[PDB]
Amino acid sequence: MSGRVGDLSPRQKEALAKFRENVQDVLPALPNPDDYFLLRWLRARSFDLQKSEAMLRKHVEFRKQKDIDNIISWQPPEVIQQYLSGGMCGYDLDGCPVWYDIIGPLDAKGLLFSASKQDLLRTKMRECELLLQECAHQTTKLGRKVETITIIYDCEGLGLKHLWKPAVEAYGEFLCMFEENYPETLKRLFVVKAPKLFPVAYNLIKPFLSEDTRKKIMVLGANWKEVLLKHISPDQVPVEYGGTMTDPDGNPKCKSKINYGGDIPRKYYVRDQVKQQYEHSVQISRGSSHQVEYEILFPGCVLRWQFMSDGADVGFGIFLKERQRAGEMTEVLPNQRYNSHLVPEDGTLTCSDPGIYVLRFDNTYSFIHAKKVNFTVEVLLPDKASEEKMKQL
Ligand SMILES: CC1=C(C)C(=O)C(CC[C@](C)(O)CCC[C@H](C)CCC[C@H](C)CCCC(C)C)=C(C)C1=O
């Protein structure tokens, strides 16, 4: 069977009955704990009564701690309302709400420098509650249960800026929240206009995604508009995404419903940087240098780093290769001096040729002694299945 209302095996039927008894004591503090609702928790844990109960009880505690009953009435900070991209727009052919995610022009640095991480995550929880409320409205209007959503995930403009570690970590917090609190709610997700970086970028968040969620991700190729119109009526899709919908004023992007992000004006910043810790720490003597070595064997990889120096600037560059001088190696990112004592540095490098990469901190120009550099480096790998998907498409 399928474990859904109208299609339960004898054993799933019995488990649903037992489940309701087992969690009776939390059902009152839920808005609408019908059979559809309960079966989402049971499907998410394959009808394991004990695991499904832990999951739901954790969600009940979540709703209390995060004041979810009142979150739609909570108004997000102005900077977030103005610049957090994405939006609800249209319904698919089954009547499910469609949500657009717009990744390219999202300015995650600006957002984290202008608002609390807590307020950003609360805004995303609120989006989920708004989508569930829309499902409830569709349920009434269409005369049948609607409880899932279709996502259009627009990766046009996805680039190295989106790999910035604090942004990935924050997004991962949201994904975990989504997976723990909104099980069996995603129906299908279309990735559109994915660029070459998509396999690396996806691999960064893949660990936060449930198997159920992973299975619902469809990466689309050049014909993506035609694919969307297999699933959504043209008058429900913006002109921008292949349909006929516009803003009342005729704007093809339907900006009255979809936020397209943009860089946050610096007047909103409350900080210059987020709190950061580093995996490594070195004291570099006057006139000296420090090298850090990473083997990159596989095609498709990206080096990501962050560093800060204490009290003074430092030289930094990347070479391709035995304690070797810089001049003996091949330059891949030309050395330059950075003021990483003032604002911490972060960067990324696409590793087009395999070999041994050397990140070199350079103090050879300096009289200041015992310059302390703190740093973190990782080699980011592409997701293999995604690479293969790209290849064809
Ligand atoms: C608040 C917020 C922040 C701070 C943010 O950085 C991002 C982009 C995260 C990223 C890692 O920079 C870019 C990640 C790109 C990567 C290709 C994402 C792939 C996502 C998958 C297609 C699954 C999505 C899960 C869905 C079911 C919610 C988004 C979308 C935010 O909303």
Cα 307 to Cα 279: distance, rounded to the nearest angstrom: 10
Per-residue DSSP letter, 103: -
Helix, strand, coil percentages for the chain (3-state, nearest 5): 40, 25, 35
Cα 147 to Cα 128: distance, rounded to the nearest angstrom: 12
Cβ-contact 155, 194 below 8 angstroms? yes
Token pair for 117: 């991480």
C-alpha pair distances (Å), 14 with each of 9, 34, 72, 246, 382: 9, 16, 36, 49, 44
Q: State whether the beta carbon of 213 lies less than 6 angstroms from ligand 1.
A: yes
Per-residue DSSP letter, 57: H
Q: Measuring CA to CA, which residue among 285, 335, 275, 350 is closest to residue 308?
A: 275
H/E run at residue 125: helix 117-142
Q: State whether the beta carbon of 192 lies less than 6 angstroms from ligand 1.
A: no
Q: State whether the beta carbon of 202 lies less than 6 angstroms from ligand 1.
A: yes
Residue with the two structure tokens 């994405």: 86
Cα 348 to Cα 79: distance, rounded to the nearest angstrom: 27
PDB experimental method: X-ray
CA 158 to ligand 1 center in whole angstroms: 10
C-alpha pair distances (Å), 376 with each of 136, 340, 345, 346, 386: 46, 13, 11, 9, 26
Resolution, angstroms, 1 dp: 2.0
Cβ-contact 113, 273 below 8 angstroms? yes
Sheet holding 289-296, edge to edge: 289-296, 355-362, 314-320, 330-338
C-alpha pair distances (Å), 8 with each of 14, 96, 103, 258: 9, 23, 39, 38
Amino acid identity of residue 203, one-letter, is N
Bridge partners of 153?
101, 191
CA 171 to ligand 1 center in whole angstroms: 6
Q: Which of 121, 162, 304 to mutate to test the pocket of ligand 1 (most atoms within 8 A of CB)?
A: 162
Closest atom of ligand 1 relative to the 162 alpha carbon? 12
C-alpha pair distances (Å), 337 with each of 13, 314, 364, 366: 67, 5, 11, 11
- Is residue 364 classed as helix, strand or coil in its secondary structure? coil
Cα 95 to Cα 146: distance, rounded to the nearest angstrom: 7
CA 93 to ligand 1 center in whole angstroms: 25
CA 186 to ligand 1 center in whole angstroms: 15
Q: Using only C-alpha atoms, what is the Rg of the chain?
A: 25
Token pair for 4: 């859904």
H/E run at residue 301: none
CA 162 to ligand 1 center in whole angstroms: 9
Cβ-contact 313, 367 below 8 angstroms? no
Cα 174 to its chain centre, rounded Å, is: 7
Cα 119 to Cα 77: distance, rounded to the nearest angstrom: 7
- Is residue 334 classed as helix, strand or coil in its secondary structure? strand
Cα 345 to its chain centre, rounded Å, is: 22
Cβ-contact 184, 44 below 8 angstroms? yes
Cα 205 to Cα 155: distance, rounded to the nearest angstrom: 14
Q: Which domains does the chain have, with CATH numbers?
A: 1-275+382-393 (3.40.525.10), 276-381 (2.60.120.680)
Token pair for 156: 């046009």
Amino acid identity of residue 34, one-letter, is D
Cα 208 to Cα 10: distance, rounded to the nearest angstrom: 33
Residue with the two structure tokens 């900006």: 255
